[PDB]
Amino acid sequence: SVIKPEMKIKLRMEGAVNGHKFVIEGEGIGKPYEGTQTLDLTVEEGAPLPFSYDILTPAFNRAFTKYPEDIPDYFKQAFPEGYSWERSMTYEDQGICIATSDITMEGDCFFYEIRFDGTNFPPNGPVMQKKTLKWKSPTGKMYVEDGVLKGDVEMALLLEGGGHYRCDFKTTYKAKKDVRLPDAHEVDHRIEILSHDKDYNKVRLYEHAEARY
């Protein structure tokens, strides 16, 4: 396989949230067959971000998923050539984000080109007021629709003061080459900011993900 037991990551995200432009770069490393990875992320333009960092973190690669032998691994099969994804993230208070990622590989490193746009977040809502704690860890669904792999997951951010704030995720995946398509299955995720500096100009971000029926 071209996917090694350890793979490096390099990424660049550009985008805007409620008009505020930014650029974030990341470098990391993970274990694709164990479903784990860590990224160090830096805000290169647009600091300090005036919105919750948490809305960005699932945009910062399902190749880092432990797949059982009897479920075809769409993501690892997609390499060396790579794959892209398109995602809508529809929050309960009418804030909306849409993001795209083009994922390539060279040697022992993945590269992501990420576009992230978000609008219509209420000025006094939990995103613009930075009242979010972390993402809950739901089970997502993977399924194929007429030869295309899709993902849906009902997400939620925990809030300061004990509440929750929901978001519907819908993703479409596109391998650059034809690969074996899996049957419908699930993916468990946990994503966590491990460390950050005061205004999240520096962020260390971890994900563990595993597929199952």
Side-chain angles (χ1 to χ4, degrees), residues 7 31 54 65-66 96 125 143-144 150-151 175 209:
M7 292 293 282
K31 292 174 167 178
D54 291 316
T65 312
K66 185 189 294 177
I96 301 165
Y143 63 96
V144 175
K150 305 187 167 160

Side-chain angles (χ1 to χ4, degrees), residues 9-157:
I9 305 161
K10 177 148 189 172
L11 64 90
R12 185 182 178 274
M13 176 187 283
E14 189 170 24
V17 170
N18 275 28
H20 185 91
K21 295 185 176 69
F22 63 92
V23 178
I24 295 171
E25 293 178 349
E27 284 182 334
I29 191 160
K31 292 174 167 178
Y33 300 92
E34 303 190 2
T36 56
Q37 51 166 138
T38 303
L39 274 166
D40 291 311
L41 303 150
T42 67
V43 178
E44 280 301 318
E45 300 175 20
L49 304 172
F51 55 82
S52 169
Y53 204 92
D54 291 316
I55 71 170
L56 304 174
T57 55
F60 297 127
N61 177 13
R62 288 271 58 76
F64 293 105
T65 312
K66 185 189 294 177
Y67 263 85
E69 279 190 10
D70 61 340
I71 304 176
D73 191 337
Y74 183 88
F75 305 102
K76 296 190 178 69
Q77 289 181 88
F79 292 91
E81 295 88 351
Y83 76 102
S84 63
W85 56 253
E86 302 175 7
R87 181 176 291 159
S88 63
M89 294 157 282
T90 298
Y91 291 89
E92 58 167 79
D93 66 349
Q94 304 186 332
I96 301 165
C97 300
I98 51 173
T100 64
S101 186
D102 193 48
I103 298 174
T104 53
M105 190 200 81
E106 297 189 326
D108 68 341
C109 192
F110 297 113
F111 303 77
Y112 322 155
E113 176 195 324
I114 309 170
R115 180 73 203 185
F116 189 100
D117 293 278
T119 67
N120 292 89
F121 287 102
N124 297 325
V127 170
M128 298 314 297
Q129 295 298 319
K130 293 173 180 167
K131 296 297 182 194
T132 71
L133 303 182
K134 60 183 275 298
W135 291 102
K136 294 200 179 177
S137 296
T139 306
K141 301 177 185 186
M142 289 286 180
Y143 63 96
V144 175
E145 190 138 48
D146 284 339
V148 64
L149 189 62
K150 305 187 167 160
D152 294 343
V153 56
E154 292 176 284
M155 297 274 280
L157 285 159

